[PDB]
Design an enzyme around this catalytic site. Structure first.
Site, PDB file in Angstrom:
ATOM      1  N   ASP A 223       0.941  -1.269  -0.016  1.00  0.00           N
ATOM      2  CA  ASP A 223       0.046  -0.086  -0.090  1.00  0.00           C
ATOM      3  C   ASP A 223       0.790   1.173   0.022  1.00  0.00           C
ATOM      4  O   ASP A 223       1.485   1.660   1.135  1.00  0.00           O
ATOM      5  CB  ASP A 223      -0.982   0.130   1.178  1.00  0.00           C
ATOM      6  CG  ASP A 223      -1.967   1.156   1.176  1.00  0.00           C
ATOM      7  OD1 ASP A 223      -2.254   1.884   0.202  1.00  0.00           O
ATOM      8  OD2 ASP A 223      -2.697   1.461   2.352  1.00  0.00           O
TER       9      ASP A 223
ATOM     10  N   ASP B 274      -1.430   5.457  -5.596  1.00  0.00           N
ATOM     11  CA  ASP B 274      -2.031   4.683  -4.444  1.00  0.00           C
ATOM     12  C   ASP B 274      -2.150   3.155  -5.000  1.00  0.00           C
ATOM     13  O   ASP B 274      -3.238   2.829  -5.646  1.00  0.00           O
ATOM     14  CB  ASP B 274      -3.007   5.157  -3.939  1.00  0.00           C
ATOM     15  CG  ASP B 274      -3.571   4.447  -2.636  1.00  0.00           C
ATOM     16  OD1 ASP B 274      -2.892   3.682  -2.281  1.00  0.00           O
ATOM     17  OD2 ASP B 274      -4.953   4.874  -2.201  1.00  0.00           O
TER      18      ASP B 274
HETATM   19  N1  LIG Z   1      -4.579   3.009  -0.033  1.00  0.00           N
HETATM   20  C1  LIG Z   1      -5.356   2.596   0.821  1.00  0.00           C
HETATM   21  N2  LIG Z   1      -5.224   1.825   1.841  1.00  0.00           N
HETATM   22  C2  LIG Z   1      -6.455   1.370   2.711  1.00  0.00           C
HETATM   23  C3  LIG Z   1      -7.420   2.391   2.227  1.00  0.00           C
HETATM   24  O1  LIG Z   1      -6.750   3.052   0.813  1.00  0.00           O
HETATM   25  C4  LIG Z   1      -6.582   0.195   2.760  1.00  0.00           C
HETATM   26  C5  LIG Z   1      -7.026  -0.375   1.372  1.00  0.00           C
HETATM   27  C6  LIG Z   1      -7.277  -1.928   1.202  1.00  0.00           C
HETATM   28  C7  LIG Z   1      -7.614  -2.374  -0.101  1.00  0.00           C
HETATM   29  C8  LIG Z   1      -8.991  -2.918  -0.337  1.00  0.00           C
HETATM   30  C9  LIG Z   1      -9.045  -3.416  -1.630  1.00  0.00           C
HETATM   31  C10 LIG Z   1      -8.130  -3.617  -2.618  1.00  0.00           C
HETATM   32  N3  LIG Z   1      -6.991  -2.775  -2.249  1.00  0.00           N
HETATM   33  C11 LIG Z   1      -6.699  -2.490  -0.859  1.00  0.00           C
HETATM   34  F1  LIG Z   1      -5.594  -2.079  -0.714  1.00  0.00           F
HETATM   35  C12 LIG Z   1      -7.451  -2.612   2.505  1.00  0.00           C
HETATM   36  C13 LIG Z   1      -7.263  -1.930   3.612  1.00  0.00           C
HETATM   37  C14 LIG Z   1      -6.948  -0.615   3.662  1.00  0.00           C
HETATM   38  O2  LIG Z   1      -6.404  -0.202   4.978  1.00  0.00           O
HETATM   39  C15 LIG Z   1      -6.031   0.985   4.987  1.00  0.00           C
HETATM   40  C16 LIG Z   1      -5.753   1.571   6.373  1.00  0.00           C
HETATM   41  F2  LIG Z   1      -6.060   0.550   7.526  1.00  0.00           F
HETATM   42  C17 LIG Z   1      -5.295   2.661   6.840  1.00  0.00           C
HETATM   43  C18 LIG Z   1      -5.182   3.645   5.748  1.00  0.00           C
HETATM   44  C19 LIG Z   1      -4.814   5.001   5.776  1.00  0.00           C
HETATM   45  C20 LIG Z   1      -4.217   5.200   6.967  1.00  0.00           C
HETATM   46  C21 LIG Z   1      -3.819   6.455   7.544  1.00  0.00           C
HETATM   47  O3  LIG Z   1      -4.151   7.783   6.556  1.00  0.00           O
HETATM   48  C22 LIG Z   1      -3.793   7.218   5.380  1.00  0.00           C
HETATM   49  C23 LIG Z   1      -5.015   6.085   4.950  1.00  0.00           C
HETATM   50  C24 LIG Z   1      -5.648   3.108   4.400  1.00  0.00           C
HETATM   51  C25 LIG Z   1      -6.005   1.808   3.898  1.00  0.00           C
END
Ligand SMILES: NC1=N[C@@]2(CO1)c1cc(-c3cccnc3F)ccc1Oc1c(F)cc(C3=CCOCC3)cc12
Length: 370
Positions: A34, A220
């Site tokens: 991520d 992202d």
């Molecule tokens: N890019 C991003 N990652 C997220 C949301 O978008 C995310 C995406 C996914 C997911 C789902 C489906 C497909 N593909 C993915 F990466 C899963 C789980 C997930 O968890 C978090 C999380 F726990 C915290 C945060 C943040 C924390 C602090 O400030 C910034 C944002 C972001 C995410």
């Protein structure tokens, strides 16, 4: 970097993950990659969706930081307990580092039912780490404690199983064709970039370019779609609607509310327009453009979903953009490189492209400020 090629796996719409180990003796986990967050956080309790989880009681090298962390985000939440331990990436560099690990002990809509990953690897910068910027992100620890160069690159190749490569500490030239073109990392928090022009089939949307980056534009890997700010999405859909008017679709489809289907092997690719984002270049008044196909923004669910959506958090260049390109996160030089991906999906008429240089004035005005 042959050893790292094909080190990413996933299911469509559920992100890309990499195998990691944590603790001594090493405990293997699959971890979501991520570039849109900055914490390393792993399941540490027997949630029913999990294949496995981090068992701190079995690690002689586990150190408790005696601090909790609480992480709501727009589509879910996790909370956990901070510690450090030894971490390695089996199909990564031959090193082992002491990293911060948030042991996840409660969560909501974070883990995905049926997915094969158990944690998240936030590769963005300390400024957006939780609880604050004092919790050193994994990559920061990796570069500080080893001689791994301060960059990584992603080739995302796109439930159907997806694949890809995360090259840690370098660039593998077999993963792309043509030249890399670089856009500056505007600020080190998210991987923030500036989009200076948008075209649909070469037709300029003709918006004030600040709109394209209101309130930010980011690269992202943890977002599936291309997300656009509301006003830009409106304008982009309007143009995509017109360009594809030879076949008519329901209004809800453009909002992602329903699918569209054709007989197997007769998806009318050519009626759908290409989308071009011009990015700020390395030189004053110089830009370049990246161009994606409907193969990128129409997602399989032959039926398909529209994978562009509106945003209130700015432009998100997610998997829809990234699966077109080899993307170089050149942290050392505060820039992001794009090149045509050797694995991207296309047809015999059109391919994703990275082209330049172009002449674009007032690019600094495209950035949003408070
Ligand atoms: N890019 C991003 N990652 C997220 C949301 O978008 C995310 C995406 C996914 C997911 C789902 C489906 C497909 N593909 C993915 F990466 C899963 C789980 C997930 O968890 C978090 C999380 F726990 C915290 C945060 C943040 C924390 C602090 O400030 C910034 C944002 C972001 C995410």
């Amino acid at each position: 970097f042959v050893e790292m090629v094909d080190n990413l796996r996933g299911k469509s719409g559920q992100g890309y993950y990499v195998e990691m180990t944590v603790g001594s003796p090493p405990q293997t986990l699959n971890i979501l990659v991520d570039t849109g967050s900055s914490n390393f956080a792993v399941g540490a309790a027997p949630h029913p969706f999990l294949h496995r989880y981090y068992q701190r009681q079995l690690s002689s090298t586990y150190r408790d930081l005696r601090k909790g962390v609480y992480v709501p985000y727009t589509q879910g939440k996790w909370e956990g307990e901070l510690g450090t331990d030894l971490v390695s990436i089996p199909h990564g560099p031959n090193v082992t580092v002491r990293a911060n690990i948030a042991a996840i002990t409660e969560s909501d809509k974070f883990f995905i039912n049926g997915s094969n990953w158990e944690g998240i690897l936030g590769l963005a910068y300390a400024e957006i780490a939780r609880p604050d910027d004092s919790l050193e992100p994994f990559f920061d620890s990796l570069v500080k404690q080893t001689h791994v160069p301060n960059l990584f690159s992603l080739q995302l190749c796109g439930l159907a199983s997806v694949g890809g490569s995360m090259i840690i500490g370098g660039i593998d030239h077999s993963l792309y064709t043509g030249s890399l073109w670089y856009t500056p990392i505007r600020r080190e928090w998210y991987y923030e970039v500036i989009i200076v022009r948008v075209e649909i089939n070469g037709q300029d949307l003709k918006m004030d370019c600040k709109e394209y980056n209101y309130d930010k534009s980011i690269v992202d890997s943890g977002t599936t779609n291309l997300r656009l700010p509301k006003k830009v999405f409106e304008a982009a859909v309007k143009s995509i609607k017109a360009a594809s008017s030879t076949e008519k679709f329901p209004d809800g489809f453009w909002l992602g509310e329903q699918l569209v289907c054709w007989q197997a092997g007769t998806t009318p690719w050519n009626i759908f327009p290409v989308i071009s984002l011009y990015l700020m270049g390395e030189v004053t008044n110089q830009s370049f453009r990246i161009t994606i196909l409907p193969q990128q923004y129409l997602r399989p669910v032959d039926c398909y979903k529209f994978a562009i959506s509106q945003s209130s958090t700015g432009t998100v260049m997610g998997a829809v953009i990234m699966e077109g390109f080899y993307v170089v996160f050149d942290r050392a030089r505060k820039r992001i490189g794009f090149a045509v991906s050797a694995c991207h999906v296309h047809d015999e008429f059109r391919t994703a492209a990275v082209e330049g240089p172009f002449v674009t004035l007032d690019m600094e005005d495209c950035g949003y400020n408070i």
